[PDB]
């Protein structure tokens, strides 16, 4: 499955729900959206803390993203951390819009796509690909 499309559909949906029409395998997209909503409710303190402590500006966004992503996957990968990675990118995009720095969304989407293609892709494929994530979540 194309990771770039997965990132784009995911971010696009999150922003559209804030009235922001961003100028940017259906089961996979819907499943990821649901798993991410579940993650953010089940781990609300983490979600809420990250959201309020970003201190996001165009000068720091890339460094904050790199730092958090390296910390997230430090002890290895699992599907829950992959969902957390998407929700973190979503928090970054959402905060960028809230702070009137919406152009950052494009950079964020690229960094997410790159990290998936360069660092998560092998793990994902070794686990059977996104079909495995779909099965695990249900469908
Ligand atoms: C260092 C740093 C600061 C870095 C940055 C950062 C951070 C801070 C803010 C933000 Cl915003 C982002 C990141 C943190 C914060 N940290 C990040 C990691 N966090 C994790 C917490 C739990 C797991 C886990 O549990 N991982 S797991 O064991 O692999 C597993 C288990 C169950 C399910 N899904 C089930 C679904 C069951 N069905 C539902 C449908 O009805 C049928 C039954 C439950 S919902 C569900 C439950 C959990 C996850 C997703 C969905 C899935 S999953 O959905 O991915 C699936 F199923 F595999 F697909 C996978 C992995 C990591 C904890 C908090 C730390």
Domain locations along the chain: 1-139
Q: How far apart are CA 99 and CA 56, in angstroms?
A: 8
Q: How far is the CA of 87 from the centre of ligand 1 (A)?
A: 10
Q: How far is the CA of 48 from the centre of ligand 1 (A)?
A: 15
Contact 108, 61 (CB under 8 A): yes
User: What is the full DSSP assignment across 41-98?
Assistant: HHTHHHHHHHHHS----TTTHHHHHHHHHHHHTTT---HHHHHHHHHHHHHHHHHHHH
Return the residue matching tokens 């992503």.
69
- With H, G, I as helix, E, B as strand and everything else as coil, classify residue 23: coil
Residues with CB under 6 A from ligand 1: 35, 38-39, 42-43, 46-47, 50, 68, 71-72, 78-81, 83-84, 87-88, 91, 133, 136-138
* Helix (H) / strand (E) containing 22: none
Q: How is residue 31 written in tokens?
A: 């499943």
Q: Which of 4, 7, 14 is nearest to 97 (CA)?
A: 14
Q: How far is the CA of 42 from the centre of ligand 1 (A)?
A: 8
Residue 126 φ/ψ, nearest 5 degrees: -65, -20
Resolution of this entry, Å: 2.0
Q: Which residues, at least 6 apart from 132, have a Cβ–Cβ distance to it below 8 Å? A: 79
Way the structure was solved: X-ray
Contact 92, 54 (CB under 8 A): yes
Q: How many beta carbons lie within 10 A of that of residue 80, not counting itself?
A: 14
């Amino acid at each position: 499955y194309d990771n770039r499309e997965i990132v784009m559909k995911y971010i696009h949906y999150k922003l559209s729900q804030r009235g922001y029409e961003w100028d940017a395998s259906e089961v996979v997209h819907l499943t990821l959206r649901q798993a991410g909503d579940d993650f953010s409710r089940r781990y609300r303190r983490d979600f809420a803390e990250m959201s309020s402590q970003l201190h996001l500006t165009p000068f720091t966004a890339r460094g904050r993203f790199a730092t958090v992503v390296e910390e997230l996957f430090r002890d290895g990968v699992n599907w829950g951390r992959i969902v957390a990675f998407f929700e973190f990118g979503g928090v970054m995009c959402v905060e960028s819009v809230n702070r009137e720095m919406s152009p950052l969304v494009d950079n964020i989407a690229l960094w997410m796509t790159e990290y998936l293609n360069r660092h998560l892709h092998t793990w994902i494929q070794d686990n059977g690909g996104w079909d495995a994530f779909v099965e695990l979540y249900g469908p």
